[PDB]
Amino acid sequence: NQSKRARSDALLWLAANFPEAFDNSLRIRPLKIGIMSDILQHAEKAEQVGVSKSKLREAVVLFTRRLDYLACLKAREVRIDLHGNPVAEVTEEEAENASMKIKKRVE
């Protein structure tokens, strides 16, 4: 319960500070491989408002396990950094891994 609200807080902090990556009100886009390391460079600012590094990791894990995120991992879609800049493209293997994950969760 407390850990859940702490995870939700981390997700709200991610959407407020990096909405290009984590504001999913209209769209969701593939994230850079290693986006977690980029987020953790901001850990000091997050901790001042009550968000720990481990809650930042839990929030990214929750965000990227959602089916709508897995569904956006299609071959040659663009991966973005925290500010929505294009950095790479989704590979066929990554797209296959994502669809396999979706099929497992609905079963």
Author numbering: 19 to 125
From the paper:
The ProQ/FinO family of RNA binding proteins mediate sRNA-directed gene regulation throughout gram-negative bacteria.
This construct had the same binding affinity as 1–126, indicating that this additional region does not play a significant role in RNA binding.
